[PDB]
Design an enzyme around this catalytic site. Structure first.
Site, PDB file in Angstrom:
ATOM      1  N   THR A  19       0.855  -1.180   0.000  1.00 28.03           N
ATOM      2  CA  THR A  19       0.000   0.000   0.000  1.00 28.03           C
ATOM      3  C   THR A  19       0.891   1.230   0.000  1.00 28.03           C
ATOM      4  O   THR A  19       1.836   1.311   0.793  1.00 28.03           O
ATOM      5  CB  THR A  19      -0.931   0.025   1.222  1.00 28.03           C
ATOM      6  OG1 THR A  19      -2.068  -0.812   0.983  1.00 28.03           O
ATOM      7  CG2 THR A  19      -1.413   1.433   1.495  1.00 28.03           C
ATOM      8  N   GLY A  20       0.594   2.184  -0.885  1.00 27.80           N
ATOM      9  CA  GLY A  20       1.401   3.383  -1.008  1.00 27.80           C
ATOM     10  C   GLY A  20       0.650   4.615  -1.477  1.00 27.80           C
ATOM     11  O   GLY A  20      -0.586   4.633  -1.502  1.00 27.80           O
ATOM     12  N   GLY A  23      -1.659   4.145  -4.412  1.00 29.85           N
ATOM     13  CA  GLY A  23      -2.751   3.206  -4.213  1.00 29.85           C
ATOM     14  C   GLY A  23      -2.337   1.881  -3.601  1.00 29.85           C
ATOM     15  O   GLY A  23      -1.329   1.797  -2.896  1.00 29.85           O
ATOM     16  N   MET A  86       5.766  -9.743 -10.366  1.00 27.05           N
ATOM     17  CA  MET A  86       7.211  -9.838 -10.117  1.00 27.05           C
ATOM     18  C   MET A  86       7.397 -10.324  -8.684  1.00 27.05           C
ATOM     19  O   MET A  86       7.320  -9.545  -7.735  1.00 27.05           O
ATOM     20  CB  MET A  86       7.889  -8.496 -10.407  1.00 27.05           C
ATOM     21  CG  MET A  86       7.445  -7.956 -11.753  1.00 27.05           C
ATOM     22  SD  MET A  86       8.424  -8.757 -13.068  1.00 27.05           S
ATOM     23  CE  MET A  86      10.096  -8.281 -12.597  1.00 27.05           C
ATOM     24  N   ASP A 130      11.371   8.894 -14.390  1.00 25.72           N
ATOM     25  CA  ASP A 130      11.658   8.700 -12.962  1.00 25.72           C
ATOM     26  C   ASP A 130      12.392   7.375 -12.742  1.00 25.72           C
ATOM     27  O   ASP A 130      11.992   6.544 -11.928  1.00 25.72           O
ATOM     28  CB  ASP A 130      10.381   8.773 -12.127  1.00 25.72           C
ATOM     29  CG  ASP A 130      10.658   8.855 -10.635  1.00 25.72           C
ATOM     30  OD1 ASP A 130      11.806   9.142 -10.251  1.00 25.72           O
ATOM     31  OD2 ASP A 130       9.723   8.634  -9.836  1.00 25.72           O
ATOM     32  N   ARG A 134      13.919   2.153  -6.934  1.00 26.75           N
ATOM     33  CA  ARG A 134      12.581   2.017  -6.372  1.00 26.75           C
ATOM     34  C   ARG A 134      11.526   1.753  -7.440  1.00 26.75           C
ATOM     35  O   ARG A 134      10.432   1.296  -7.092  1.00 26.75           O
ATOM     36  CB  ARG A 134      12.197   3.263  -5.565  1.00 26.75           C
ATOM     37  CG  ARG A 134      12.155   4.512  -6.421  1.00 26.75           C
ATOM     38  CD  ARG A 134      11.724   5.751  -5.653  1.00 26.75           C
ATOM     39  NE  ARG A 134      11.797   6.911  -6.534  1.00 26.75           N
ATOM     40  CZ  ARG A 134      12.921   7.563  -6.775  1.00 26.75           C
ATOM     41  NH1 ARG A 134      14.039   7.253  -6.144  1.00 26.75           N
ATOM     42  NH2 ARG A 134      12.931   8.537  -7.679  1.00 26.75           N
ATOM     43  N   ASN A 135      11.824   2.019  -8.715  1.00 27.09           N
ATOM     44  CA  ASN A 135      10.889   1.774  -9.812  1.00 27.09           C
ATOM     45  C   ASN A 135      11.314   0.590 -10.667  1.00 27.09           C
ATOM     46  O   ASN A 135      10.893   0.469 -11.817  1.00 27.09           O
ATOM     47  CB  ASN A 135      10.736   3.035 -10.666  1.00 27.09           C
ATOM     48  CG  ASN A 135       9.899   4.088  -9.983  1.00 27.09           C
ATOM     49  OD1 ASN A 135       8.983   3.771  -9.201  1.00 27.09           O
ATOM     50  ND2 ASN A 135      10.193   5.351 -10.265  1.00 27.09           N
ATOM     51  N   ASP A 148       6.713   1.390 -14.292  1.00 24.86           N
ATOM     52  CA  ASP A 148       6.163   2.765 -14.148  1.00 24.86           C
ATOM     53  C   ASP A 148       6.836   3.744 -15.104  1.00 24.86           C
ATOM     54  O   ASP A 148       6.955   4.907 -14.765  1.00 24.86           O
ATOM     55  CB  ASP A 148       6.237   3.207 -12.689  1.00 24.86           C
ATOM     56  CG  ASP A 148       5.299   2.458 -11.763  1.00 24.86           C
ATOM     57  OD1 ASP A 148       4.741   1.442 -12.190  1.00 24.86           O
ATOM     58  OD2 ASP A 148       5.148   2.902 -10.628  1.00 24.86           O
TER      59      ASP A 148
END
Ligand SMILES: O=C(N[C@@H]1CCCN(c2ncnc3[nH]ccc23)C1)[C@H](Nc1cc(F)cc(Cl)c1)C1CC1
Length: 260
Positions: A19-20, A23, A86, A130, A134-135, A148
């Site tokens: 959860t972030g 969403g 993933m 970006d 983290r992505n 993303d």
């Protein structure tokens, strides 16, 4: 249902993955058989009509090292994004798990995974905008894939801007280009060889921006050979036009793979 549209009745929700701010992401099955990730977009967080139109173009981006978009569910709220599952989660968390006891050959393979994805996006004139560990996500075979890509264009929410992954011309003038993705990729290689340390860890974002604009740089992670460091450092030329392409970076990485 359009070709970019998935019927949500085809989804079975099985587990929450995280959860972030954008969403909630769940693990599920499509038509009772195929693993998927289901991203349920937080109400009010995205420019949804713009995102849906761009999803049509995202459907045509397909590469083994890009996290695959399967479709969107837009008839109801929250809208769902249906993507490749993933199993090993976010690359940043994976790097920070010291039990893996990574060899440097594995770290270089993660860089090559990302560079292949990024070379494909470059060949389509598509910017990530970006790029950062983290992505990136990791599957059950340990393959890293880029996620993303392009998403930040539709986020409505700066105190959360990726200063530490941004070249001087972005910080100074908001000049985004292929070469700002190149800069970020160099920082990402630094994250990988640093096992997930924060870039410029002792600095605030404001201090980082001053550091970088003064011409100062990240320096060599302990696990990076001289040849690997040369590759990531080449991404940080003050002059954007002197930074390599992702095609050249991939060639350089493959060369080091062979030598090492
Ligand atoms: O996806 C994200 N975070 C999840 C957390 C749980 C672990 N993840 C996964 N685990 C397994 N398979 C997976 N596929 C895909 C993801 C995933 C990543 C983030 N992006 C994002 C974008 C949105 F528009 C809406 C939301 Cl809510 C999130 C960001 C990329 C890291």
């Amino acid at each position: 249902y359009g070709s970019w549209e998935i019927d949500p009745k085809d989804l079975t929700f099985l587990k929450e993955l995280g959860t972030g701010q954008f969403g909630v992401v769940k693990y599920g099955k499509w038509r009772g058989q195929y693993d998927v990730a289901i991203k349920m977009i937080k109400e009010g967080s995205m420019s949804e009509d713009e995102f849906i139109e761009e999803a049509k173009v995202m459907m045509n981006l397909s590469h083994e090292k890009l996290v695959q978009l399967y479709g969107v569910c837009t008839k109801q709220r929250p809208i769902f994004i249906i993507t490749e599952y993933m199993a090993n989660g976010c690359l940043l968390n994976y790097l920070r798990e010291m039990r893996h006891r990574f060899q440097t050959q594995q770290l270089l393979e993660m860089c090559k995974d990302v560079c292949e994805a990024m070379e494909y996006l470059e060949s389509k004139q598509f910017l990530h905008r970006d790029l950062a560990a983290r992505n990136c996500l990791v599957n059950d075979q340990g393959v890293v894939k880029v996620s993303d890509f392009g998403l930040s264009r539709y986020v409505l929410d700066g105190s959360k801007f990726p200063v530490r992954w941004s070249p001087p011309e972005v910080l100074m003038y908001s000049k985004f280009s292929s070469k700002s993705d190149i800069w970020a990729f160099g920082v990402l290689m630094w994250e990988i060889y640093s096992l997930g340390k924060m870039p410029y860890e002792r600095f605030t974002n404001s201090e980082t921006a001053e550091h970088i604009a003064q011409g100062l740089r990240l320096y060599r992670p302990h696990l990076a050979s001289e040849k690997v460091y040369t590759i990531m450092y080449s991404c940080w030329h003050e002059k954007a036009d002197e930074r390599p392409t992702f095609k050249i970076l991939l060639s350089n990485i493959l060369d080091v793979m062979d030598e090492e």
